[PDB]
Amino acid sequence: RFLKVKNWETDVVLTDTLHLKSTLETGCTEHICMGSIMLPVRTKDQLFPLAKEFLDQYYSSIKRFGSKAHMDRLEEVNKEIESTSTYQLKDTELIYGAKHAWRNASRCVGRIQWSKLQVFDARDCTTAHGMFNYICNHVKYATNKGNLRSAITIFPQRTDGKHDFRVWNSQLIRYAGYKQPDGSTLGDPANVQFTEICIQQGWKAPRGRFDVLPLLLQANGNDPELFQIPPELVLEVPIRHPKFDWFKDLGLKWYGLPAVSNMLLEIGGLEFSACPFSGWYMGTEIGVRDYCDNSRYNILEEVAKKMDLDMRKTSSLWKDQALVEINIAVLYSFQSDKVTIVDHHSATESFIKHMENEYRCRGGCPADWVWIVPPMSGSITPVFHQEMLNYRLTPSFEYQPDPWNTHVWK
Amino acid sequence: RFLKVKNWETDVVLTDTLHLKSTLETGCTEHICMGSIMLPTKDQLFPLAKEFLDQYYSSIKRFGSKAHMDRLEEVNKEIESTSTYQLKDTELIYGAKHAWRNASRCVGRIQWSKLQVFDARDCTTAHGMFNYICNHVKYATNKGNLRSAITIFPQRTDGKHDFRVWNSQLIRYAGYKQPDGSTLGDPANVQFTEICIQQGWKAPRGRFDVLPLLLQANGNDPELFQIPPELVLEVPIRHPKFDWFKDLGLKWYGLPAVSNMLLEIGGLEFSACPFSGWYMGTEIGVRDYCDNSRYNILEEVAKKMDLDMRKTSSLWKDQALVEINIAVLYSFQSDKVTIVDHHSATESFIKHMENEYRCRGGCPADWVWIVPPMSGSITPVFHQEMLNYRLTPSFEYQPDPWNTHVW
Numbered sequence: 013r014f015l016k017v018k019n020w021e022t023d024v025v026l027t028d029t030l031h032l033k034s035t036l037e038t039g040c041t042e043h044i045c046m047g048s049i050m051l052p053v054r055t056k057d058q059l060f061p062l063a064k065e066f067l068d069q070y071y072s073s074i075k076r077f078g079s080k081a082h083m084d085r086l087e088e089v090n091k092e093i094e095s096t097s098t099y100q101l102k103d104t105e106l107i108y109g110a111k112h113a114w115r116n117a118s119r120c121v122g123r124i125q126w127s128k129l130q131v132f133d134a135r136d137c138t139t140a141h142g143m144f145n146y147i148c149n150h151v152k153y154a155t156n157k158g159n160l161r162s163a164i165t166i167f168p169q170r171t172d173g174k175h176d177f178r179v180w181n182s183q184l185i186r187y188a189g190y191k192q193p194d195g196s197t198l199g200d201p202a203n204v205q206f207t208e209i210c211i212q213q214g215w216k217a218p219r220g221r222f223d224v225l226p227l228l229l230q231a232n233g234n235d236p237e238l239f240q241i242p243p244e245l246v247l248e249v250p251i252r253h254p255k256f257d258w259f260k261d262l263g264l265k266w267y268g269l270p271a272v273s274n275m276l277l278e279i280g281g282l283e284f285s286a287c288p289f290s291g292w293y294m295g296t297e298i299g300v301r302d303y304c305d306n307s308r309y310n311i312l313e314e315v316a317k318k319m320d321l322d323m324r325k326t327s328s329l330w331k332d333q334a335l336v337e338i339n340i341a342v343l344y345s346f347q348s349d350k351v352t353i354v355d356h357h358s359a360t361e362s363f364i365k366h367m368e369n370e371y372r373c374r375g376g377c378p379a380d381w382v383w384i385v386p387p388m389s390g391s392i393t394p395v396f397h398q399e400m401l402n403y404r405l406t407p408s409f410e411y412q413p414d415p416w417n418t419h420v421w422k
Numbered sequence: 423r424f425l426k427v428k429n430w431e432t433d434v435v436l437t438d439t440l441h442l443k444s445t446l447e448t449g450c451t452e453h454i455c456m457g458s459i460m461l462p463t464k465d466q467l468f469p470l471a472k473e474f475l476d477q478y479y480s481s482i483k484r485f486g487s488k489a490h491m492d493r494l495e496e497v498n499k500e501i502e503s504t505s506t507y508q509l510k511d512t513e514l515i516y517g518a519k520h521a522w523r524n525a526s527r528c529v530g531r532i533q534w535s536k537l538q539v540f541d542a543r544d545c546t547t548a549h550g551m552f553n554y555i556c557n558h559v560k561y562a563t564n565k566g567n568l569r570s571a572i573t574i575f576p577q578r579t580d581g582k583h584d585f586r587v588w589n590s591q592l593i594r595y596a597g598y599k600q601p602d603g604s605t606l607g608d609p610a611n612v613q614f615t616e617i618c619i620q621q622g623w624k625a626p627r628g629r630f631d632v633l634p635l636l637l638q639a640n641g642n643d644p645e646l647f648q649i650p651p652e653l654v655l656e657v658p659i660r661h662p663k664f665d666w667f668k669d670l671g672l673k674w675y676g677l678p679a680v681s682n683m684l685l686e687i688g689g690l691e692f693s694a695c696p697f698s699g700w701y702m703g704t705e706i707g708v709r710d711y712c713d714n715s716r717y718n719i720l721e722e723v724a725k726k727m728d729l730d731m732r733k734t735s736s737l738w739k740d741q742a743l744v745e746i747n748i749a750v751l752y753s754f755q756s757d758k759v760t761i762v763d764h765h766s767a768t769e770s771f772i773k774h775m776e777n778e779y780r781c782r783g784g785c786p787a788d789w790v791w792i793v794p795p796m797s798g799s800i801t802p803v804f805h806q807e808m809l810n811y812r813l814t815p816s817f818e819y820q821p822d823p824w825n826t827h828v829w
């Protein structure tokens with residue numbers, strides 16, 4: 013069944029056949045759509061078919077489907093699974109897998125960049141200190157003095173479910189959040205629970221507004237250990253405005269490297285529970301969401317005041333006006349400091365080109381419109397006008413519960 | 423079977439059971455989500471009629487009453503005999519109000535119970551329709567203090583005697599493709615504008631020319647009518663700070679009145695049911711003025727504001743977008759014409775959803791359409807999970823008549 017997808021601004025119509033290979037569920041039924049819902053030990057039984065699908069996908073990508081190399085590998089894996097209950101991916105398969113997980117991530121607008129991912133194989137890691145070392149090397153490589161390079165570090169896969177490797181942080185670099193007795197919050201409210209766990213584990217918090225959190229690392233299912241990322245490795249950007257000299261006095265700054273560290277990478281049935289990856293930021297992630305969400309730094313009012321905007325009525329659009337200036341400030345500061353960043357106009361335009369390319373070369377591109385459309389100026393970006401089909405392909409990045417909710421303390 | 427909907431900004435969680443009463447398909451499947459897609463017999467009739475009547479008597483606390491039973495049998499016999507039936511005025515009004523209540527793409531539903539319903543089922547000709555429409559426009563405009571209303575023309579019979587308003591909205595501006603290759607006026611109505619031209623209309627060939635009504639009664643060919651200028655309220659757009667703004671020569675009409683949809687109540691289809699409420703600012707300021715396929719005025723505005731348009735990263739489109747929307751709102755308020763900003767409208771909708779969840783067990787809502795076209799995350803609905811499903815009575819899309827009419 014071929015599915016048509018139309019762009020209501022250019023009338024360009026695309027055809028999707030890729031969805032035919034979708035196996036996983038979406039959350040929607042023929043009677044209800046859960047399109048805006050945030051969150052809608054494998055058995056030997058279920059492991060081999062998953063492995064075979066992956067290996068077939070892999071051998072077809074390298075144009076060796078049906079070869080002797082292909083048939084031997086399938087037999088070798090089948091035997092390995094029966095023999096040990098799991099199997100080990102070859103390096104080439106791991107790289108291909110990690111890249112495809114990114115190519116298949118429907119909530120990511122930065123996928124035009126997928127084939128350029130540097131994969132660091134950390135499957136030989138055994139302890140938390142080992143993890144810390146791999147993580148530092150990843151941050152130094154990815155940061156590259158501001159000329160950001162996409163990367164992913166893959167730690168040992170899940171075995172029995174009791175020896176998991178986990179990065180307890182949500183991103184390798186994030187600011188601490190502290191709830192005050194008066195009910196106010198100091199720092200980033202989004203990380204309050206994690207910050208408490210860190211203090212409980214021994215972290216001596218400086219209790220400021222932009223304290224970089226320590227890494228809390230779990231190796232082989234053992235209790236997590238704290239480590240401080242070397243300051244010289246953490247690139248930060250002071251935020252100032254090109255026309256408003258008082259902006260710098262707001263005392264805002266942000267880290268240059270976004271590094272998701274809480275997702276699960278699934279490849280050929282195998283599960284990598286610690287797979288920190290990094291790219292670069294789209295400005296609105298910082299300027300709209302991190303600074304302006306009511307539940308985050310929530311600076312719209314303070315900025316609105318300094319701009320002396322009419323804040324007596326919402327119809328003056330004082331929030332919208334201030335929102336734009338803060339976003340101008342974020343982009344301006346990063347570019348001035350020569351730290352990679354992409355604005356939402358550029359990122360979305362590139363995503364449409366990526367999508368058209370994918371439809372022609374791959375038969376499709378799963379995309380979640382709810383997440384792809386930027387949180388500000390939605391309709392003045394081309395993605396707003398683009399119909400998109402969302403479905404799940406593997407390899408993939410999946411959510412997993414926060415580790416503190418499932419860990420058995422020793 | 424019981425679904426939960428969470429608001430990630432307030433952590434408030436609501437349970438939805440209303441969806442279990444849904445009957446129509448969404449377009450999605452367990453394998454693919456089509457949530458961002460724009461356009462996803464007597465034996466058929468009675469079950470539909472029964473479902474409706476049952477909901478109706480339940481709403482008036484007479485479920486299982488003799489009146490209920492009696493009515494069900496009357497309609498039943500009427501269908502058997504006539505192959506259709508007629509709604510009591512009370513049912514017509516209830517249905518229209520609920521069609522609005524169930525419109526998942528409408529952010530203005532907190533107002534659903536205040537809908538003035540005009541029964542035009544006795545209409546027979548295009549002149550008759552024109553009269554009803556003029557009365558609707560005057561009533562709803564109310565000198566600027568807009569009042570929601572819908573006018574319901576005769577229901578479908580054999581599909582060969584259908585009433586249709588060919589316009590997309592009762593009031594819209596013409597669009598013409600010029601020699602230059604460019605488009606003059608509103609590009610979205612270029613085609614219809616041509617059907618009016620070809621039909622006989624004399625276009626002033628301007629940038630904001632109110633189009634003529636093209637009315638179809640009982641399947642006959644449509645006829646043209648000029649809406650009395652005095653009945654079309656318009657707002658000249660100026661900025662509370664940029665005196666040059668007025669020189670852009672922009673204006674819009676105060677009354678948004680969707681006229682091409684189909685109203686379905688108890689299996690009965692009303693193909694001509696124009697309705698009107700009032701505008702949410704962004705509909706004009708963001709979509710009509712700034713879509714690249716619409717008036718597309720961003721550059722011009724940015725230029726007059728004299729900002730660097732060399733690089734997208736200076737966010738000049740965004741800066742200008744905001745000013746343009748400040749201008750629309752300021753103007754309507756200045757002229758005392760009802761209008762609502764996206765912040766207030768979205769705040770209302772969250773209140774409405776809460777009312778609906780506790781009083782009805784839920785609220786179908788299409789997130790893709792509910793979240794405003796600008797400043798998405800600073801409005802509350804962005805952070806609100808929403809379940810979309812189809813409940814009836816409802817407003818449905820239908821083909822443009824010029825693609826089905828046999829002249």
Ligand code: HEM
Nearest residue numbers: 114117119120121122125162163289290291292293294409
């Ligand atoms: C090259 C720069 C990249 C840009 C500009 C980009 C941009 C984005 C943005 C804007 C989002 C939404 C984030 C949010 O709203 O919280 C996102 C999500 C995502 N991206 Fe990318 N991304 C890039 C690289 C990557 C890389 C390196 C990977 C994996 C190898 C990746 C995987 C994902 C995933 C799985 C999501 C969903 C995260 C979630 O659900 O919280 N992205 N990306």
Ligand code: HEM
Nearest residue numbers: 522525527528529530533570571697698699700701702817
């Ligand atoms: C009282 C003020 C009202 C406000 C502020 C409001 C606002 C809106 C807005 C912003 C949209 C999106 C329009 C678009 O993007 O094209 C919408 C759609 C819609 N509204 Fe409302 N609305 C109001 C009254 C009404 C009334 C009285 C009805 C019907 C009785 C109604 C039926 C619907 C329907 C069916 C749609 C979807 C239209 C489509 O699919 O093109 N609305 N409304």
Ligand SMILES: N=C(NCCC[C@@H](NC(=O)[C@H](N)Cc1ccccc1)C(N)=O)NN(O)O
Nearest residue numbers: 050051182183270272289290291292293294
């Ligand atoms: N630019 C990015 N952006 C991805 C950032 C993803 C960002 N996501 C979030 O913070 C999501 N809110 C996590 C979430 C999802 C669903 C339900 C609850 C919570 C994070 N991990 O920091 N990445 N790279 O690699 O460049």
Ligand SMILES: N=C(NCCC[C@@H](NC(=O)[C@H](N)Cc1ccccc1)C(N)=O)NN(O)O
Nearest residue numbers: 460590591678679680697698699700701702
């Ligand atoms: N404020 C409103 N807004 C409703 C405006 C609805 C508006 N809708 C539209 O213009 C839709 N984009 C038409 C469409 C739908 C799907 C595919 C293609 C085209 C119209 N009819 O003018 N209504 N009242 O009554 O207050």
Ligand SMILES: C[C@H](O)[C@H](O)[C@H]1CNc2nc(N)[nH]c(=O)c2N1
Nearest residue numbers: 048049050382383804805806807
């Ligand atoms: C409820 C709704 O799904 C939720 O607020 C989504 C909307 N779109 C988003 N889009 C992106 N990129 N990131 C988010 O966190 C969200 N949050």
Ligand SMILES: C[C@H](O)[C@H](O)[C@H]1CNc2nc(N)[nH]c(=O)c2N1
Nearest residue numbers: 396397398399458459460790791
């Ligand atoms: C492709 C996508 O569905 C389309 O552009 C939708 C997005 N959201 C919208 N939302 C509203 N209110 N109105 C629209 O016309 C649209 N267009």
Ligand SMILES: OC[C@@H](O)[C@@H](O)[C@H](O)[C@H](O)CO
Nearest residue numbers: 182202203204205206274414
């Ligand atoms: O403070 C803990 C939170 O940061 C954590 O629960 C995140 O919300 C989660 O990891 C998603 O990023």
Ligand SMILES: [Zn+2]
Nearest residue numbers: 040045450455
């Ligand atoms: Zn769906």
